[PDB]
């Protein structure tokens, strides 16, 4: 369980594709680009680390 | 020819009007009911702990579709803590005919800032003209704190962009929020946010409630009462300084209520969480009157303007750190229209 704020809300789509590729569920409030990501905790870090290579987001623990 | 009376049924007990002193003040002894009782198609979003959907006083105004529980992902089925029902009654007693929609983001354990934002956005997209958030968090503005605030600010921007008013309780810590920020690096959210109207609580005497948070963010005040004017120092509770609330009818109310023969469905209470919805209720009244007179919707700024100019200027002359622009009075609001 962590939280993400995209720099740009248009990148919601690229967020939901990285999340599915790491079997983590990302619940995004589209209009503000703020998401709650839940899944298994080993994989939250690689999800954060490959989401970080394409889109800009800040993460909360 | 009949004396005016509260919209609440009060179980027919005429003595309960004493505890509705705040409502009589707001509505000019309920004269506003014949000036503007509110429109059923003006909707106030209740971001709170759910709602007692079949409360005798609230069921006529409850959104027929009920509302969403974000904690369990189910439609709202009731109100476990009673908090949202108390908040709902304050909207209702001022504007008995506006629609109230519960967005349940709180229960016993508390709530998540995330669900408040989601409810804000949904409430906007669902055609609500007013949002009331009678809860908040004290957030440290470290790295993750600033991100939460940044997120929260976008939600507020979204409501403002769509001309939706958002009213929030200022909080009950009896602290100066500006001093809290410089000393503790904390902020009270969402009340501190731009485009969120932060509301404090005054007493029957119009003195600020001792618990009411103060600061430059305070915009308005409303009568939320307290246990006593000086209870904090002398231990004495003056029950006439408290305010009546609608309380879940199937829930036991307090020993103080029982001793005063307040039947279930009502409870004596206090707080900024009870002040904010009085202003939200007043806003819904202004929107209802304005739409009735022009068949156009007013801007958020227009309603805010009416609230601001009709407020009673208390304390230092002008917008001060204790009362903001001052105490909101619904009948004055309508009178200036």
Q: Which of B301, B277, B62 is nearest to B164 (CA)?
A: B301
Cα→Cα distances B259→B255, B268, B302, Å: 6, 11, 45
Count Cβ atoms within 10 A of the Cβ of residue B144 and give its class: 0-12 exposed, 13-18 middle, 19 or more buried.
Answer: middle
Under the phi-then-psi rule, with left for phi > 0, alpha for psi from -120 to 50, and beta for the rest, what region is B28?
Answer: left
| Pair B167, B81: CB distance under 8 Å | no
How far does A22 lie from chain B, in Å, by closest CA?
A: 22
CA–CA dist B198, B323 (Å, integer): 10
Q: How far apart are CA B48 and CA B153, in angstroms?
A: 19
B295 in active site: no
- B250, B51 in Cβ contact below 8 A? no
B142 and chain A in contact, CB less than 8 A: no
Interface residue A5 vs chain B (CB under 8 A): yes
The resolution, in Å, is 2.3
Q: How far apart are CA B34 and CA B300, in angstroms?
A: 24
Parallel, antiparallel or unpaired: strands B99-104 and B110-111: unpaired
Alpha helices in B60-112 (DSSP H): 83-94
Cis (ω within 30 of 0) for the bond into B190?
yes
Three state DSSP letters for B200-234 = EEECCCCCECCCCCECCCEEEEEECCCCCCCHHHH
Q: Please tell me the distance from the alpha carbon of residue B20 to that of residue B268, in angstroms, as a whole number.
A: 10
Choose among B145, B134, B139: nearest CA to B187. Answer: B139
Residue with tokens 């991100």: B147
Cβ-proximal residues to B151 (8 Å cutoff; 6+ apart), any chain? A5, A32, A34, B117
Whether residue A36 and residue B155 make contact (CB cut-off 8 A), yes or no, is no
Helix (H, G, I), strand (E, B) or coil at B131: strand
Report the gap between the CA of A1 and the closest CA in chain B (Å): 12
Q: Does the beta-carbon distance from B147 to A36 stay under 8 Å?
A: no
Best A26, A29, A56, A59 member to test B by mutation, with max B CBs in 10 Å, is A29
Indicate if B83 belongs to the active site. yes
Per-residue burial over B85-116, b if 16 or more Cβ lie within 10 Å, else e, is: bbbbbbbbbbbbbbbbbbbbbbbeeebbbbbb
Count Cβ neighbours within 10 Å for each residue of B198-217 and write b for 16 or more, e otherwise.
bbbbbbbeeebbbbbbbbeb
Q: Cα separation of A56 and B312, whole Å?
A: 47
Q: 3-state DSSP helix/strand/coil percent for chain B, to nearest 5?
A: 35, 20, 45
Among residues B184, B207, B187, which one has the least CA distance to residue B322? Answer: B207
Contact state of A32 with B121 under an 8 Å Cβ cutoff: yes
Sheet of A2-6, strands arranged across: A25-29, A34-38, A2-6, A57-60
B81/B62 Cα distance (integer angstroms): 18
The angle at the Cα of B101, spanning B201 to B199, to the nearest 5 degrees, equals: 15
Distance (Å, whole) CA B67 – CA B102: 5
Residues B278-294: b if buried by 16+ CB within 10 A, e if exposed: bbbbbbbbbbbbbbeee
Token representation of residue B272: 């900024």
Residues linked to residue B187 through DSSP beta bridges, in sequence order: B139
- CB-hemisphere CA count at 13 Å for B190? 32
Q: What is the rounded CA–CA span in Å between residue B208 and residue B223?
A: 9
- Give the C-alpha separation, B10 to B231, whole Å: 27
Q: How far apart are CA B65 and CA B44, in angstroms?
A: 14
Q: Which residues are CB-contacts of B162 (< 8 A; sequence separation ≥ 6)?
A: B124
Query: By CB neighbour count within 10 A (0-12 exposed, 13-18 middle, 19+ buried), where does B21 fall?
Result: middle
Overall size of chain A counted in residues: 61
Closest C-alpha among B198, B204, B205, B203 to residue B220: B198
Across A1-61, the runs of DSSP E, i.e. the strands, are 2-6, 25-29, 34-38, 57-60
Enumerate the domain spans of chain B: 1-337
Catalytic-labelled residue, pool B39, B55, B83, B128: B83
How far is residue B109's CA from residue A54's CA, in Å, rounded to a whole number? Answer: 37
Residue B201 contacts residue B274 (beta carbons within 8 Å): yes
CA nearest to B265, candidates B86, B107, B100? B86
- Cα–Cα–Cα angle for B122, B269, B234, nearest 5°? 140
Question: Which residues of chain A neighbour B125 with C-beta distances below 8 Å?
Answer: 31
Radius of gyration of chain A (CA): 10
SS (H, E, C) B162-174: CCCEEEEECCCCC
Strands in B197-202's sheet, in edge-to-edge order, are: B74-75, B68-69, B99-104, B43-48, B130-133, B165-169, B197-202, B218-223
**CATH tag for B1-337 (out of 3.30.565.10, 3.40.640.10, 3.40.50.200, 3.40.47.10):** 3.40.50.200
Q: Are B92 and B100 in contact (CB under 8 A)?
A: yes
For chains A and B, count residue pairs whose Cβ atoms are closer than 8 Å.
33
**Of B148, B100, B103, nearest to B122 (Cα)?**
B103
User: Could you tell me which of B8, B37, B46, B104 has the C-alpha nearest to residue B276?
Assistant: B46
Q: What is the DSSP letter of A55?
A: S
């Amino acid at each position: 369980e962590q939280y993400l704020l995209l720099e740009h809300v248009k990148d919601k789509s690229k967020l939901l594709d990285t999340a599915e590729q790491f079997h983590i569920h990302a619940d995004v409030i589209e209009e503000i680009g703020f998401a709650k990501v839940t899944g298994e905790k080993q994989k939250l870090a690689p999800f954060t680390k490959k989401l970080a290579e394409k889109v800009g987001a800040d993460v909360i623990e | 020819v009949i004396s005016g009376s509260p919209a609440w049924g009060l179980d027919g007990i005429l003595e309960l009007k004493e505890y509705l002193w705040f409502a009589a003040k707001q509505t000019d002894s309920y004269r506003t009911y014949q000036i503007e009782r509110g429109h059923p198609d003006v909707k106030v979003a209740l971001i709170d702990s759910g709602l007692d959907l079949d409360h005798p006083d609230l069921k006529a105004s409850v959104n027929t579709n009920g509302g969403w529980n974000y904690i369990d992902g189910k439609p709202v089925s009731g109100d476990p803590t009673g908090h949202g029902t108390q908040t709902a009654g304050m909207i209702n007693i001022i504007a008995p005919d506006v629609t109230i929609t519960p967005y349940q983001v709180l229960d016993e354990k508390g709530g998540d800032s995330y669900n408040i934002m989601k409810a804000m956005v949904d409430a906007v997209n669902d055609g609500h003209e007013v949002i009331n958030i009678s809860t908040g968090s004290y957030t440290s503005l470290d790295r993750e704190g600033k991100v939460l605030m940044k997120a929260y600010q976008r939600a507020a921007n979204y409501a403002a962009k769509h001309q939706v008013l958002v009213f929030s309780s200022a909080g009950n810590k009896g602290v100066n929020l500006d001093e809290m920020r410089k000393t503790e690096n904390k902020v009270h959210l969402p009340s501190a946010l731009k485009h969120v109207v932060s509301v404090g609580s005054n007493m029957k005497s119009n003195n600020i409630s001792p618990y009411s948070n103060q600061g430059r963010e305070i915009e308005f005040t409303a009568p939320g009462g307290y246990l006593g004017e000086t209870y904090d120092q002398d231990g004495m509770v003056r029950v006439t300084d408290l305010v009546l609330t609608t309380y879940p009818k199937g829930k036991d109310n307090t020993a103080l209520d029982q001793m005063l023969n307040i039947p279930k469905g009502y409870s004596l209470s206090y707080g900024t969480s009870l002040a904010a919805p009085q202003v939200a209720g007043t806003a819904a009244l202004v929107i209802s009157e304005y739409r009735e007179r022009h068949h156009r919707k007013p801007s958020a700024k227009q309603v805010h303007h009416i609230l601001r100019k009709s407020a009673l200027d208390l304390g230092k002359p002008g917008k001060d750190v204790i009362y903001g622009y001052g105490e909101v009075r619904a009948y004055q609001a309508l009178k200036m229209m």
